[PDB]
Design an enzyme around this catalytic site. Structure first.
Site, PDB file in Angstrom:
ATOM      1  N   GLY A  11       0.804  -1.209   0.000  1.00 33.33           N
ATOM      2  CA  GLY A  11       0.000   0.000   0.000  1.00 33.33           C
ATOM      3  C   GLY A  11       0.834   1.255   0.000  1.00 33.33           C
ATOM      4  CE  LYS A  33       3.778   0.779   7.729  1.00 34.93           C
ATOM      5  NZ  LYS A  33       2.639   1.452   8.426  1.00 34.93           N
ATOM      6  CG  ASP A 123      -3.823   9.470  10.972  1.00 35.67           C
ATOM      7  OD1 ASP A 123      -5.048   9.741  10.957  1.00 35.67           O
ATOM      8  OD2 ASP A 123      -3.279   9.171   9.892  1.00 35.67           O
ATOM      9  CD  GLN A 127      -8.099   3.404   6.759  1.00 34.42           C
ATOM     10  OE1 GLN A 127      -8.963   3.198   7.614  1.00 34.42           O
ATOM     11  NE2 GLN A 127      -7.853   4.619   6.258  1.00 34.42           N
ATOM     12  CG  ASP A 141       1.896   3.708  10.618  1.00 32.69           C
ATOM     13  OD1 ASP A 141       2.753   2.791  10.549  1.00 32.69           O
ATOM     14  OD2 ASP A 141       1.273   4.013   9.573  1.00 32.69           O
TER      15      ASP A 141
END
Ligand SMILES: Nc1cncc(Cl)n1
Length: 283
Positions: A11, A33, A123, A127, A141
């Protein structure tokens, strides 16, 4: 990077591309990432390294941080599914309440830990909640927003321009995710900041000085906001029971100092009968 064989693009995250990869010296399968230029800011490097120590079973493990060739790669433990896909997968039946409760309980355990070390996520969204075959759910995250897109889960104090927000913002987001698990629709699917704020107001009532002292002095508050009446929670999240609704209302308190803490939410009667079911997942 040379030690990793990318197996697939998984993604495009907030910060860049996310790959499934395999490490060649360990054989371990990981989430790689790529972040994002000036030559990676030194403070971001220091923040990220603090995160390597913030370990908990309900937090996706930051395996490694590769600052090489003036680029930044974060290597995380790999999980095969996220809550967004699982919710889509579960649309016709809905996630069973026992499992919703287990997920919320584990997420709150994760938040309580991070919050106890003064680290926020900022955040949260379906997801970045990752699930396994063991019935575990983990936050991905964590800490990255401070170290370095949907409005749906954003707390009102952020929307209202508060610059010095607290751990309460994560509790708000998780309440929104909880409601969404229960109803199989997003609570507040705003498509601009005003539409997000106004959707919140239409359900919980436009906030005033009675429910939220200091609200009318916030940077982006306007005396001209329409004044909607609060709806009843029994209309918002049927057929959630009285314990769940009670908890949800505390997670969605306007005043961030009134909003329930992760740690106090863990003691809520809703969790009296929590279990750890295993989900049905096809990988
Ligand atoms: N998409 C994934 C899978 N595992 C870990 C992370 Cl951080 N993301």
């Amino acid at each position: 990077m040379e030690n990793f064989q990318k197996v697939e693009k998984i993604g495009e995250g907030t910060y860049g591309v996310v790959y499934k990869a395999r490490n060649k010296l360990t054989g371990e399968v990981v989430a790689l990432k790529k972040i994002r230029t000036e030559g990676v800011p030194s403070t971001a490097i220091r923040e990220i390294s603090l995160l390597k120590e913030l370990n908990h079973p309900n937090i996706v493990k930051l395996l490694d941080v590769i600052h090489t060739e003036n680029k930044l790669y974060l290597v995380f433990e790999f999980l095969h599914q996220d809550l967004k896909k699982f919710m889509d997968a579960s649309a016709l039946t809905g996630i069973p309440l026992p499992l919703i409760k287990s997920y919320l309980f584990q997420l709150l355990q994760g938040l309580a830990f991070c919050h106890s070390h003064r680290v926020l996520h900022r955040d949260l969204k379906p997801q970045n909640l990752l699930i396994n075959t063991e019935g575990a759910i983990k936050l991905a995250d964590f800490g990255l927003a401070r170290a370095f897109v949907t409005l749906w889960y954003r707390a009102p104090e952020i929307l209202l321009g508060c610059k010095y927000y607290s751990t309460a913002v994560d509790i708000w987001s998780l309440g929104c995710i909880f409601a969404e698990m229960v109803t199989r629709r997003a609570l507040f699917p705003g498509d601009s900041e005003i539409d997000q704020l106004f959707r919140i107001f239409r359900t919980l009532g436009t906030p005033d000085e009675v429910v939220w002292p200091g609200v009318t002095s916030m940077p982006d508050y306007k005396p001209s906001f329409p004044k909607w009446a609060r709806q009843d929670f029994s209309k918002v999240v049927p057929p959630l029971d009285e314990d769940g609704r009670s908890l949800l209302s505390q997670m969605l308190h306007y005043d961030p100092n009134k909003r329930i803490s992760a740690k106090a939410a863990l003691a809520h009667p809703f969790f009296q009968d929590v279990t750890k079911p295993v989900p049905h997942l096809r990988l």
